[PDB]
Amino acid sequence: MNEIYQKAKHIKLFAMDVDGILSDGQIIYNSEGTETKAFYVQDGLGLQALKQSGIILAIITGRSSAMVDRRAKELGISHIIQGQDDKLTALVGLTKKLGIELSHCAYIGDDLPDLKAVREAGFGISVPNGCEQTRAVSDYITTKTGGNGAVREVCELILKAQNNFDAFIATFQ
Amino acid sequence: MNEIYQKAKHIKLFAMDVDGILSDGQIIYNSEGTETKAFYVQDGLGLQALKQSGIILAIITGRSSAMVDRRAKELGISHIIQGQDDKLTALVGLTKKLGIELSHCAYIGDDLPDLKAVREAGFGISVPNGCEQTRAVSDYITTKTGGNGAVREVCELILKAQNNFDAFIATFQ
Amino acid sequence: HMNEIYQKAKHIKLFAMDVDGILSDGQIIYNSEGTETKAFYVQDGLGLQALKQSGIILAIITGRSSAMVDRRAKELGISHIIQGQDDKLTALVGLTKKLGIELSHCAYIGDDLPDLKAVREAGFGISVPNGCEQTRAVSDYITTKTGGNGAVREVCELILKAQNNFDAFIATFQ
Amino acid sequence: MNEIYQKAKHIKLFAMDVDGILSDGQIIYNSEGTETKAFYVQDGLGLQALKQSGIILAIITGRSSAMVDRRAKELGISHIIQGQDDKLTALVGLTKKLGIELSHCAYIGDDLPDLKAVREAGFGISVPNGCEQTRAVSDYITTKTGGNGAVREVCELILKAQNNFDAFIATFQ
Numbered sequence A, B, D: 001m002n003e004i005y006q007k008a009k010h011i012k013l014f015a016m017d018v019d020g021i022l023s024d025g026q027i028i029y030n031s032e033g034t035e036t037k038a039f040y041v042q043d044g045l046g047l048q049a050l051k052q053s054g055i056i057l058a059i060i061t062g063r064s065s066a067m068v069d070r071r072a073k074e075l076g077i078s079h080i081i082q083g084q085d086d087k088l089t090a091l092v093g094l095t096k097k098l099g100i101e102l103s104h105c106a107y108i109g110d111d112l113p114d115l116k117a118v119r120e121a122g123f124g125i126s127v128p129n130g131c132e133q134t135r136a137v138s139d140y141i142t143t144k145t146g147g148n149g150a151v152r153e154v155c156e157l158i159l160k161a162q163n164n165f166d167a168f169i170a171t172f173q
Numbered sequence C: 001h002m003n004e005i006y007q008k009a010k011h012i013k014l015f016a017m018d019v020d021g022i023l024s025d026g027q028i029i030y031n032s033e034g035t036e037t038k039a040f041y042v043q044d045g046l047g048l049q050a051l052k053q054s055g056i057i058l059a060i061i062t063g064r065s066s067a068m069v070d071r072r073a074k075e076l077g078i079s080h081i082i083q084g085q086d087d088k089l090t091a092l093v094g095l096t097k098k099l100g101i102e103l104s105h106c107a108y109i110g111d112d113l114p115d116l117k118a119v120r121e122a123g124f125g126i127s128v129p130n131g132c133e134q135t136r137a138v139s140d141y142i143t144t145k146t147g148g149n150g151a152v153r154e155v156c157e158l159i160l161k162a163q164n165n166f167d168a169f170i171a172t173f174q
């Protein structure tokens, strides 16, 4: 847990995958051509906290949806990359647009397109529903599953590692 | 048992958070622009019993939708405060608007905005899926999770504390 | 409790279901366009059709009221659909007088207090792991599978086994 | 662990039930007459993988919807058969039309309509949520449930049977 905290302490960008991370991985369709996606309410509040403690937020996702666009904006997530399977490339790109390198990125994913990004990121994170290969290259596995607070969980972990957890807690005490 | 019963026994007003308490915390979006939210049937029954026992019911949530409006109104929940993250201030307002006292209020919530209100209501309640900071400040933690009968459970428990449970049960025999 | 349950299920002619908490897991779902959604379980479908095919009359008795229930009820051959009814025991007896059969031959399943009297008086009353304590204490049988997750299928199989239609029912797919 | 490794190995056709396998079995309806079905994101990648190793994919399903044909088209499943409970007929019908043996078909089912098709396929699979009889007639039962990575799991098993797994992982390392 020592080495976990170093990696997190130095994080400047938090980059999330969507399906399996911000959601439980359910891809929903109905009979009139409309897709649906479910997100988790405590995730948003934890992401609002990291936003405001200086850390910038991004989404890199293989699919493309209005739901993701819609959710990211209300959460103050700023960089929205959709229809991108090549995750490490996308991550590196942001690093150079924002002037902080790979060492300064956190990234969280559940599945194979994610592994290289979770491997090279300064702080790579997977979840219990992530395949075994992505988990093995991760610096941290969440207690919680995607769509059920894994994102909020790492949100707190980084805030703890940056010493902004107590300030964030005190705001609501 | 009793250190928790006398807290519940002089409750006049029962106020609730929505997301994580009335629902399981899923924020559901779709590619048409429609939001969706799921509630639990047995919660309806519990609340109706509470209202019929003499208890005023309230909703204080930080989000805003028709769904909460629909649900509240079928359940005869008279005070519906939406779009409001500062729960304690809204709860005191009710206390004054209605001429009650914080001592006679029950507040249930699952996350940080709820902390002060859960803390300052005479009978504070949270849930297993709840924040550890919000839990550490509550007088009771439900066994059921939000959107799975946490609310019904606490309706049953308040009714017991008032000696109205057996009568309520008896209505259906 | 083990072999007396066999006896009550063998003479069932009418099988009547609560919806929310029984056919569905009890999620009541609304959206911003004003639309209501409800979920049902696929294996319950197949179990109903099989009960129906063995000569059993099927009935829905629910306190809420929606098109989803009418839509589901149609596809499954459920002929008697009573919606917007909290007074279950009396709607059931109403069916039982309309079909001219007694409560002894009526199976009823419910999960909550409104279903209590019906589960109690029915010839064979069933509850679920997720029903309240009171309606359960009153059931002749409690399912292993939860509402919306097979509770109906499980009781269907049960009635067929107690009717020597089970092994014939499996045979059709063997 | 074997029996299965040998029993798979010579699979050219992989055919799947939908309700209970690709989904968790919830049949979802709404008040505008709209029907919804959920699929699982990690199964998708699993299916592309098998399809990429040279294996032909098929759905055979008792019901019929836009959701299934949509999800099949995006996942490149080529043979989609709806409105058919006679799954052993249609699969045999597929084994002739395409020139494959049955011993080379793998088939996954969860309920009685799938019993025959599972039993007599070269490699027969069921899930934990499947009924007694269909499970007792299967060669392999997934650990993960229908609509939660059961399809993904067999996708990995087959690729590992055909010594094609490590190639797939490597693509992402």
Ligand SMILES: O=C(O)[C@@]1(O)C[C@@H](O)[C@@H](O)[C@@H]([C@H](O)CO)O1
Residues within 6 Å of the ligand: B040, B041, B042, B043, B044, B045, B046, B048, C020, C028, C062, C063, C064, C086, C112, C114
């Ligand atoms: O609508 C509900 O949530 C509720 O639990 C409230 C009850 O008054 C009654 O309508 C009940 C029925 O048992 C389910 O329709 O549902």
Ligand SMILES: O=C(O)[C@@]1(O)C[C@@H](O)[C@@H](O)[C@@H]([C@H](O)CO)O1
Residues within 6 Å of the ligand: A040, A041, A042, A043, A044, A045, A046, A048, B019, B027, B061, B062, B063, B084, B085, B111, B113
């Ligand atoms: O919409 C949310 O996900 C969020 O977490 C955002 C927060 O600012 C706050 O509104 C939060 C509350 O817990 C809901 O009232 O919801």
Ligand SMILES: O=C(O)[C@@]1(O)C[C@@H](O)[C@@H](O)[C@@H]([C@H](O)CO)O1
Residues within 6 Å of the ligand: C041, C042, C043, C044, C045, C046, C047, C049, D019, D027, D061, D062, D063, D085, D111, D113
């Ligand atoms: O729709 C269902 O619930 C049911 O179980 C009943 C039938 O319509 C039949 O097609 C069956 C299939 O085994 C699954 O679709 O589904």
Ligand SMILES: O=C(O)[C@@]1(O)C[C@@H](O)[C@@H](O)[C@@H]([C@H](O)CO)O1
Residues within 6 Å of the ligand: A019, A027, A061, A062, A063, A085, A111, A113, D040, D041, D042, D043, D044, D045, D046, D048
């Ligand atoms: O759409 C999917 O099911 C799938 O798993 C397919 C993959 O090609 C890949 O794009 C994947 C993403 O990792 C999730 O959006 O989605």
Ligand SMILES: [Mg+2]
Residues within 6 Å of the ligand: A017, A018, A019, A020, A021, A109, A110, A111
């Ligand atoms: Mg993912």
Ligand SMILES: [Mg+2]
Residues within 6 Å of the ligand: B017, B018, B019, B020, B021, B109, B110, B111
């Ligand atoms: Mg909340």
Ligand SMILES: [Mg+2]
Residues within 6 Å of the ligand: B041, C018, C019, C020, C021, C022, C110, C111, C112
């Ligand atoms: Mg019910």
Ligand SMILES: [Mg+2]
Residues within 6 Å of the ligand: C042, D017, D018, D019, D020, D021, D109, D110, D111
């Ligand atoms: Mg099926």
